[PDB]
Amino acid sequence: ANKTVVVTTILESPYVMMKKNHEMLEGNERYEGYCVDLAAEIAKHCGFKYKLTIVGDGKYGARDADTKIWNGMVGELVYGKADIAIAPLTITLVREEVIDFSKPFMSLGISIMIKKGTPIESAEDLSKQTEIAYGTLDSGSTKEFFRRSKIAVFDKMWTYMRSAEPSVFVRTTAEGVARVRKSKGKYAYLLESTMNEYIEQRKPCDTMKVGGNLDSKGYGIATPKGSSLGNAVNLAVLKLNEQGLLDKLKNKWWEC
Amino acid sequence: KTVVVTTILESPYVMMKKNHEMLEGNERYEGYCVDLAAEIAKHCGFKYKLTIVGDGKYGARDADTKIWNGMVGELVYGKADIAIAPLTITLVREEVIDFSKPFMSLGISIMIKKGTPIESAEDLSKQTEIAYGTLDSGSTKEFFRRSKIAVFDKMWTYMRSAEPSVFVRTTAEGVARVRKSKGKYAYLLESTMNEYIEQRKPCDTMKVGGNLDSKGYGIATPKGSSLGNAVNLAVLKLNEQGLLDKLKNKWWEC
Ligand SMILES: [NH3+][C@@H](Cc1c(-c2nnn(Cc3cccc(Cl)c3)n2)o[nH]c1=O)C(=O)O
Ligand SMILES: [NH3+][C@@H](Cc1c(-c2nnn(Cc3cccc(Cl)c3)n2)o[nH]c1=O)C(=O)O
Ligand SMILES: [Cl-]
Ligand SMILES: [Cl-]
Ligand SMILES: [Cl-]
Ligand SMILES: [Cl-]
Ligand SMILES: [Cl-]
């Protein structure tokens, strides 16, 4: 690279977190987490300096159907605000058409979060009932998945979600988790298995993952199309995996 | 023109059809990869011819000369246009060819004959009574040669100095070596084949311990190929539509 690399990411524990004493720290030293360590290791094996930045709008990435404008970390790569995205960013077909992804460094699938005691076990259960509302993050891969799915059960769920009143969408993942906890079992949150399981095993220990994953995908490091950094970043990811660092980082950062 | 697809004869990925001697062309073969090639050829809009890799190898290179063999070599040296097989995505392979995003996941595991006193990779590295090795021309050999983890590096130090040779030249040779060694050989292979062989007679093998790593199979094309981008989007499409899970269930006793 010829400049200091601008890395965009999102504040999502345990991937990126503010240090207890971040107010006294400068630059990259303010943050900590799985993706903070991963960026240092990618930058080390690619030979560039980098500055960690938090995505301005706090979004993963969605595409406006009318204007085709992207937002979130995806938009920051498409419109030249960032050089690389190191975050739990899901590899998707639609995103792969405007940005480049490295090979996945972590796997996941869409899963269901419920409040302990809710009579729900699968997405089939959710689509066949009207007592428990459900929704997902509005600006992420999960919304994209349901919007595009030709699969009957998932299309039926999408049709219900976008027509529900009050809205069942949430604009952050934390909003979704909180909605489950305060809805007395009347709201089920559709989110990725990684965060679902993470929340499950932590206080107040009142949420739970039910059913199996709805699909199988992974997180990847993203760069803009044509960037002379994607090839290097891709090899770095594969080297860190083959050397065993990704397993070490997983164990490092991963109660009820 | 017609795209030359290189693959390898491994069940249930690629197999000979019943009465294959009387069939011609692509109709001689069937399996997960045979169905997968048709789907990718459909979404990418090209005609293709299935061919089995000449040397029956997955792909390794000489450390000094950097010359490749196996399916990787057929792509690097212009003998095939695309590889559709259980070919593992690795660092060294991605330096000379391109891979799509993984269409299937797997890890390195340990195969033993039933009754062998082994449960993990650490157990093997702590002794020599029970020999252990892996395929010589594959990604598992690359893993043990390039792994920075201590226990794996000790297994590599043992393998390349053991006597008689613990390496094998085909996966069938490794499995046969476990079944014939009366419990004195452990074969390091990928979990997909380990668990598949486990549920097939003679039913005298089993998988012990968790996977030593986590990786995936990807569709390979030579660098600069005009099929690369399209093939990658096809895999992601087939995954989104659930067809990869359909093929798995379709093609996947003790
Ligand atoms: N990853 C999706 C976003 C996304 C998620 C999601 N779930 N978990 N993450 C990351 C995460 C946060 C906190 C803790 C842990 Cl363990 C993992 N993203 O769920 N629906 C979506 O749409 C995207 O790229 O749009
Ligand atoms: N995949 C590796 C080869 C490779 C394998 C391996 N194991 N299983 N396969 C594919 C397979 C065969 C038979 C049945 C089933 Cl289910 C799966 N390849 O083990 N060590 C290696 O080095 C490579 O690309 O080099
Ligand atoms: Cl993982
Ligand atoms: Cl359906
Ligand atoms: Cl021709
Ligand atoms: Cl899989
Ligand atoms: Cl170690």
**DSSP codes, B151-175:** HHHHHHHHHTT-SS---BSSHHHHH
Protein residue with least CA distance to atom 7, ligand 1: A192
Distances (CA, A) of A63 to A81, A142, B69: 17, 13, 44
Protein residue with least CA distance to atom 15, ligand 1: A195
Q: Which CATH class is domain A109-217?
A: alpha beta
Residues of chain B with CATH 3.40.190.10: 1-106+216-252, 107-215
Distance A72 CA to ligand 1 centre (A): 13
Ligand 1 proximity of A192 Cβ (cutoff 6 Å): yes
CA distance B242 to B246: 6
CA distance B22 to B153: 49
B1-106+216-252 to CATH, choices 3.40.190.10, 3.90.850.10, 3.40.50.300, 3.50.50.60: 3.40.190.10
Q: A1-108+218-254, what's its fold?
A: D-Maltodextrin-Binding Protein; domain 2 (3.40.190)
Out of A92, A93, A104, whose CB is closest to B102? A104
Cis peptide before A119 (omega within 30 of 0): no
Q: Which residues of A fall within a CB distance of 8 Å from B216?
A: 103-104
| Residue A187, strand partner residues | A133
Q: Which residues of A fall within a CB distance of 8 Å from B237?
A: 93
Alpha-helical (H) ranges within chain B are 32-44, 70-76, 91-94, 121-125, 139-146, 150-159, 171-180, 191-198, 228-240, 243-251
Matching residue, tokens 């960032």? A82
CA distance A229 to A109: 28
CA distance B159 to B163: 9
Q: Are B215 and A107 within 8 A, CB to CB?
A: no
| Residue A192, strand partner residues | A110
Q: Which helix (H) or strand (E) is A162 found in, with range?
A: helix A152-163
B87: DSSP letter: P
Contact B174, B189 (CB under 8 A): yes
Q: B107-215, what's its fold?
A: D-Maltodextrin-Binding Protein; domain 2 (3.40.190)
Q: Which residues of B fall within a CB distance of 8 Å from A101?
A: 101
Strand-by-strand arrangement of the B185-190 sheet: B131-134, B185-190, B108-113, B205-208
Ligand 2 proximity of B100 Cβ (cutoff 6 Å): no
Distance B66 CA to ligand 5 centre (A): 31
Protein residue with least CA distance to atom 4, ligand 1: A140
What's the gap in Å between the CA of A67 and the closest CA on chain B? 23
Which ligand minimizes its atom distance to the CA of A70?
1
User: From the CA atom positions of chain B, what is the Rg in Å?
Assistant: 18
What's the gap in Å between the CA of B44 and the closest CA on chain A? 15
Atom of ligand 1 nearest to the CA of A92: 24
Ligand 2 proximity of B137 Cβ (cutoff 6 Å): no
Q: Is A192 annotated as a binding residue?
A: yes
Which ligand minimizes its atom distance to the CA of A245?
7
| Residue B206, strand partner residues | B112
Ligand 1 proximity of A195 Cβ (cutoff 6 Å): yes
Contact A26, A15 (CB under 8 A): no
